[PDB]
Amino acid sequence: VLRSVNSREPSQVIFCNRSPRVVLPVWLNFDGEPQPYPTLPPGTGRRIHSYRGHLWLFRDAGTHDGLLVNQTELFVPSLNVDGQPIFANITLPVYTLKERCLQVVRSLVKPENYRRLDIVRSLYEDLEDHPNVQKDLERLT
């Protein structure tokens, strides 16, 4: 459903990780399957060879928290104009205070011990509903 187009038209791209997280680039292949690419350290950039109509999304490499590329969720390389690369700015979204708290707590508690926490049962499942690329993919689809 959400797939890259096989345009075969090359597009030159710079992924700039403007977030404090290790960024995992994900290419959506022609069958819709997410394909991971080498990780991008915080404050670093990489020149990428992609194609017009291709689909990329970005995540925290360790936690798979969702990140933003050009203020949106999906980056589709476009036509290079004047032979300049298209810039893909990876940034942190403004998480909810709930999402941000789930992030930190997930980082401090191993999942087997989530239930040892003295919180409402609704939160037990929210901790276990860790962000996932496939879950996010279905939502956009």
Partner: protein, 103 residues
């Protein structure tokens, strides 16, 4: 540039912003709107140092690097009670519990 502050007296905390070029007196005017006390009855502090009305917040060390939205800088407030100024007091926030073993 906007500086992001917590104005604190006793058990009261104001969250507001101001321009780095703003003056201490203009911040007393801001407090006057909220807490209904005139600048003549207010003393503003950085840590333990009284701030002069004419100096800008940047000159007093409240800067964009220092006074940030997610980590605002603290300005102490002391009030005058009919001709006499109280000592600067800021009640601390509550203490967090010890970390659960699960962490």
């Amino acid at each position: 540039m906007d500086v992001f502050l917590m104005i604190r007296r006793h058990k009261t905390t104001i969250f507001t912003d101001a321009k780095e070029s703003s003056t201490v007196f203009e911040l007393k005017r801001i407090v006057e709107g909220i807490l209904k006390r005139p600048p003549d009855e207010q003393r503003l502090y950085k840590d333990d140092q009284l701030l002069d009305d004419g100096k800008t917040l940047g000159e007093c060390g409240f800067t964009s690097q220092t006074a940030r939205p997610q980590a605002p800088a603290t300005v102490g407030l002391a009030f005058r009670a009919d001709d006499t100024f109280e000592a600067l007091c800021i009640e601390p926030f509550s203490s967090p519990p010890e970390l659960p073993d699960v962490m």
